[PDB]
Amino acid sequence: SMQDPIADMLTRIRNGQAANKAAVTMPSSKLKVAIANVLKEEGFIEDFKVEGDTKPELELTLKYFQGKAVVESIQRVSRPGLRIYKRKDELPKVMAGLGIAVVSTSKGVMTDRAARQAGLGGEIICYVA
Amino acid sequence: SLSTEATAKIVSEFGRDANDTGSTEVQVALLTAQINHLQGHFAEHKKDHHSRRGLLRMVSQRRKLLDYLKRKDVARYTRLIERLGLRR
Amino acid sequence: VKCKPTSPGRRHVVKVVNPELHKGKPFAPLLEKNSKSGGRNNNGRITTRHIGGGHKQAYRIVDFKRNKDGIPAVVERLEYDPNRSANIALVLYKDGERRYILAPKGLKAGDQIQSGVDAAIKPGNTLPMRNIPVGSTVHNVEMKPGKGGQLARSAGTYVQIVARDGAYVTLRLRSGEMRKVEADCRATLGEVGNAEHMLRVLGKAGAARWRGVRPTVRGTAMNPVDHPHGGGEGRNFGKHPVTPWGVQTKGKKTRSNKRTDKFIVRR
RNA sequence: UCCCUCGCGGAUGGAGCUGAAAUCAGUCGAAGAUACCAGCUGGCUGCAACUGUUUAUUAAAAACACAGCACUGUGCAAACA
RNA sequence: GCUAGUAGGUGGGGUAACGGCUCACCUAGGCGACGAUCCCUAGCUGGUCUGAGAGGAUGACCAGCCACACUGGAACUGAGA
RNA sequence: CGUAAAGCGCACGCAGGCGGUUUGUUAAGUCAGAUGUGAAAUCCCCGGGCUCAACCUGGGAACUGCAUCUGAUACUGGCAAGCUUGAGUCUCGUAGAGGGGGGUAGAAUUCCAGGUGUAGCGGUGAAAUGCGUAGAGAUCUGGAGGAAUACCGGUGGCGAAGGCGGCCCCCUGGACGAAGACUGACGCUCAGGUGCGAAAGCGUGGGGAGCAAACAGGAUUAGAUACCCUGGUAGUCCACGCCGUAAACGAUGUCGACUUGGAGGUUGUGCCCUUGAGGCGUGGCUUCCGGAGCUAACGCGUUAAGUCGACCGCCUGGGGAG
RNA sequence: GAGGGCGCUUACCACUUUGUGAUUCAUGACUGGGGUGAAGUCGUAACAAGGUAACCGUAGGGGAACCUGCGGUUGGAUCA
């Protein structure tokens, strides 16, 4: 959005899923693609690309196993006016461990397990189940 | 609103170049005119509120631009406020 | 109020109220065409129509009719004339002449101003009613063709004609209802005199009343002799007219010349 | 002393002259705004808004007046006197 | 809305020591809606009770701190009141 | 927080909160390590002693905090230089009952005058009051005056809200489209603050046709301080100042991004044998139906009451009590 | 003689005193509305189209609900 560009990413992804869409598109961003990269390895998204050397536009591909979709849970947490910063011993564990939790570390964007395995903390980004 | 022989006129007096109808120095100054000119209009009628709403608009809108200059080139601000006899 | 400029209003300091002053007529001191003025209300012997006194006066001033014609006047300056609240302006013609006139509304700073048959229809000068449209707003007409009487009380005082009346007679004074008047007469056509000029309250007798007329109030005051009603323990009962005038309306002015005016209602 | 159309000129100089209040310190008496002179103050309530006027010579008032308000009359040779 | 030793500055004075702590003089400041001043209530804390927690309510017993000693005021002696 | 208690009547906006995209830089937030300190005792874990327990007790754990130092630089913040899609400016058009001022026209009502003409008119469910032989009503001619503008008028349009309808001119605001050109985050929200606010009402002064609180008659009725009828004052109208409320209602705060569809309205623009009423798109605003979803249900449903983000106002049982 | 003590006196100040406000709590002839009760008198306002659709604002009036005027609302029934 014009105020919360990251929160929009999640919404556009979840809104697409519900509508059983194929691919979601929206303006890119260092953090955005960075986040989009994680869900990739996590198998939450098929692939992802962008267009524009001056006018970048993210391109994500939704995913679904059977009748229902894959990403059946995606919400934010550390939003503006109410940001969240956890330690290496406070990091959340989405769905008892199954779901992932994106968190920006001094090393870069990671997941609840990722950063933990490292032994460092960062500003939580969102919960993906 | 304003006459072309005036609008297209002033633009060529504050523009740091040619036909730069965008330049704050320009737009901003262009606002003072339609404002000062209307003050003589509002002196009469008075009760005409729906027209003052627009008047106030361009006024605040003008200020929103002045603050910008101060936050982009201190000089240009004090360098323009004089040519327009602003601040009062 | 409702116009420009509003009228000052003295503030509670020493029992003080509304005053009266203009925007300005720059100068405080007249020309020369004036008399000496009489003095009191008395009639070569007896008082006559009681009430009337107090000092401060002089200053006669003049002009009316406007015999002179098609010669361009110029308003010299508005000016304040005593007893009558209708300002006065000055005016100079293109031949050093200098009458006075009854200051209309929009005037001051020079202006047009022309008299005589066929002249600019603004608020310049008199003009035979004939050479006038509807004159929803004429001025100090004249019951006769030559004079200038009528409503010289300019102060807000107007008169409405009726577009195009024939027979050579028209006009509609204020409360004067309807009344025909020789059309070979002329009217200033301006018709003004500033109303607010008569929109403040004197204040508190003395320095506002006394400076004009005496205690125009007598009421019962009792004493069955000084007035057709008095005595009593402390109240009135009966009739209270002075010299059986019969203040119960009555009306007057009967027979004789004139009385050929029209309409006149009774509410 | 400085200057100039020019002069009861102008400027700079601050002698002499005059001179309050305050602040510390001390002192006298019973008392220092010492005499003459020079508001008694407050609280509740009636009446009339208020300044003013009145029974010259027993009544100064709550009465008359007042500004304000209203009714009514008067078209000008105005009504009215 | 609060505030004249009030906020600050020179000086002397004073204390174990910095300091308006103090006095004279100079400046006209200092505080406040990020809640001053004013009123009501109150010893503070480690802790205690309840609560999954967060939190809520509290401050007996034990321990650290503070204050008081019939009431109001004062200083003496002393390293220390 | 649509109807249960809950969106301020609406705007503008200071403080405050929040802030598109890129690179460098900083290292304040933040994260990592470490050093202090966080009294002991409580609590907790493991383990000891009183025959057990309560109790007593060793060591640790914890004391989620504050500070300092050394780093890490993703994100937030600061500084520098930018970028253009947000926001804004310019150009040229478009529609509009947007506002303020001044004019002006035609229909109707009432009244005044006069002509014709004659015993009814008016009113109700009936009636009666009332008006009529001093000639009404009806009718026709002339005149005065005030208020409001049939038809077009619409499920229409404009406005922040309240609200805004005849025609004409003058001064003036906003909205939208399109080729574009320009500025370069200049933005969103906004306690307090300022301003705008239906009607009724208030002050001064005007005006006053119709309508009509009050008031007065007639009728109804058990009564009728009402509904109905005949009258009628404030008021309704104007100016200027005040009052600020309404079921000031979408009973739904403003701004932005997403998310199946169908039929229609109104206004701009591109295009199509533009041969046409016309046909295909592409923007603004707006009706009705309705899917997912949401909902306590009714229902809302791309103009959301669905999915989200920023800021603000508000609610916490009924009565008492706004 | 110094210096010191008493002493007189001066400053700071406790008590205590006088005016004058502020605030708070108790109370009072009478008086206003509220609440209960047992339900009495008087009517029927609202809920049906409640028998004049209702309600909000504002104004005036009346034993009392309430009546009437002006504007807004649907939280109005019947094909108005």
Side-chain angles (χ1 to χ4, degrees):
Chain A
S1 187
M2 320 300 170
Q3 220 172 193
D4 231 315
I6 301 302
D8 172 52
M9 166 181 253
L10 313 176
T11 315
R12 303 191 85 137
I13 290 178
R14 85 170 75 81
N15 277 333
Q17 290 276 202
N20 279 31
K21 274 290 181 189
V24 53
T25 326
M26 85 277 271
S28 311
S29 167
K30 302 293 94 277
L31 174 47
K32 287 186 192 56
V33 180
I35 297 169
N37 230 121
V38 184
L39 294 90
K40 185 193 204 161
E41 152 69 71
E42 294 314 303
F44 276 120
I45 36 183
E46 282 285 47
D47 195 15
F48 73 126
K49 192 58 181 307
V50 66
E51 181 194 82
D53 42 291
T54 183
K55 308 279 83 59
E57 183 175 57
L58 253 184
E59 307 164 5
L60 304 74
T61 33
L62 269 41
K63 185 126 54 186
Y64 32 72
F65 193 73
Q66 286 199 64
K68 203 72 189 172
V70 170
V71 196
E72 309 313 273
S73 274
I74 167 182
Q75 296 307 131
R76 210 253 174 58
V77 186
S78 186
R79 53 182 185 63
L82 194 254
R83 230 51 154 290
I84 287 86
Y85 299 73
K86 295 292 176 195
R87 278 178 157 174
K88 61 189 280 301
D89 57 75
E90 316 183 44
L91 301 170
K93 32 278 145 291
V94 189
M95 193 167 277
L98 292 80
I100 65 170
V102 195
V103 286
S104 182
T105 81
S106 200
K107 256 61 192 302
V109 194
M110 271 176 218
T111 127
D112 47 75
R113 188 241 55 170
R116 194 181 286 97
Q117 184 201 311
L120 34 52
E123 161 192 341
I124 291 178
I125 297 172
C126 58
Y127 292 173
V128 191
Chain B
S1 177
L2 206 161
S3 72
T4 66
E5 270 193 301
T7 13
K9 168 183 58 42
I10 172 173
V11 64
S12 312
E13 300 218 9
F14 294 100
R16 301 178 84 175
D17 19 285
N19 211 66
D20 37 35
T21 54
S23 166
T24 57
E25 219 101 349
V26 179
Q27 162 194 151
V28 176
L30 183 65
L31 268 301
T32 302
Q34 190 189 312
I35 282 186
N36 293 156
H37 167 46
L38 278 165
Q39 175 156 164
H41 156 48
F42 290 94
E44 188 178 328
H45 311 83
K46 317 170 295 167
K47 293 164 290 181
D48 183 16
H49 295 298
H50 298 75
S51 283
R52 189 134 52 199
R53 231 288 296 281
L55 166 66
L56 292 171
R57 187 274 173 70
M58 33 204 261
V59 174
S60 58
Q61 168 169 34
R62 170 182 68 186
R63 201 170 72 273
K64 263 100 151 288
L65 264 296
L66 296 167
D67 292 56
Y68 173 79
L69 271 308
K70 262 260 68 60
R71 304 192 276 79
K72 289 294 167 174
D73 186 284
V74 185
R76 285 218 289 153
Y77 182 73
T78 49
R79 287 175 160 205
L80 168 155
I81 52 170
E82 197 62 28
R83 278 183 59 189
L84 284 66
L86 298 150
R87 193 55 47 248
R88 340 286 185 176
Chain C
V1 207
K2 52 174 273 180
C3 333
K4 296 219 162 171
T6 40
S7 103
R10 320 207 30 182
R11 117 160 307 144
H12 227 32
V13 178
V14 183
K15 311 115 254 325
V16 191
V17 194
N18 272 38
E20 222 34 271
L21 43 49
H22 218 284
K23 178 62 188 178
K25 298 87 130 280
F27 66 102
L30 48 136
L31 222 216
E32 47 65 28
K33 321 109 72 40
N34 32 223
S35 94
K36 67 109 62 194
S37 189
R40 200 216 180 157
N41 151 40
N42 247 80
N43 165 40
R45 276 265 197 279
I46 328 297
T47 298
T48 282
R49 38 113 351 203
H50 65 298
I51 301 121
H55 272 177
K56 182 59 67 291
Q57 256 133 85
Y59 205 76
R60 214 287 72 178
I61 323 303
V62 262
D63 186 290
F64 280 138
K65 33 195 79 178
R66 306 222 239 191
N67 257 321
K68 169 187 299 291
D69 261 10
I71 300 99
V74 182
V75 175
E76 243 281 57
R77 209 74 177 62
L78 297 189
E79 232 184 312
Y80 174 56
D81 189 331
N83 273 74
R84 47 131 178 292
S85 64
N87 282 163
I88 206 167
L90 175 56
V91 158
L92 157 139
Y93 296 97
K94 314 226 165 174
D95 55 340
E97 180 66 356
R98 263 194 233 249
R99 312 282 158 88
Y100 245 112
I101 310 316
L102 273 294
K105 183 60 202 104
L107 210 67
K108 225 300 215 167
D111 301 54
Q112 278 195 51
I113 312 124
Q114 317 106 318
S115 62
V117 165
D118 266 35
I121 309 172
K122 25 198 304 306
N125 203 120
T126 336
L127 229 148
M129 235 108 88
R130 295 180 318 175
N131 324 300
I132 275 180
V134 319
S136 85
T137 299
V138 281
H139 215 323
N140 57 330
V141 197
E142 336 160 38
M143 346 249 117
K144 300 183 160 199
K147 246 164 161 183
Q150 232 322 319
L151 61 166
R153 213 275 84 52
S154 181
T157 67
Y158 279 32
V159 162
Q160 214 234 178
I161 314 183
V162 184
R164 287 171 163 284
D165 311 67
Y168 305 68
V169 264
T170 329
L171 297 191
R172 183 187 72 177
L173 323 150
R174 314 258 311 173
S175 54
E177 330 253 15
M178 251 46 96
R179 115 154 291 204
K180 272 180 170 125
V181 167
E182 339 228 312
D184 357 297
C185 177
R186 22 169 85 206
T188 293
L189 190 266
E191 209 150 78
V192 211
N194 334 98
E196 59 164 270
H197 251 295
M198 298 313 260
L199 222 176
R200 318 225 195 188
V201 14
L202 303 190
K204 295 257 69 62
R209 198 65 162 180
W210 202 258
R211 337 201 118 147
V213 302
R214 300 274 253 79
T216 331
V217 162
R218 238 54 288 306
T220 340
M222 296 1 252
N223 238 184
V225 134
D226 313 2
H227 190 311
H229 69 350
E233 50 139 27
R235 6 84 341 217
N236 311 291
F237 311 78
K239 269 201 157 171
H240 315 55
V242 206
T243 306
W245 180 326
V247 206
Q248 221 123 58
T249 294
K250 273 60 175 57
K252 279 127 305 283
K253 209 68 180 61
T254 325
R255 294 291 92 251
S256 297
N257 57 296
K258 275 295 188 137
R259 341 284 146 88
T260 183
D261 42 53
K262 40 220 298 165
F263 191 110
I264 65 173
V265 298
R266 247 132 293 199
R267 296 205 195 68

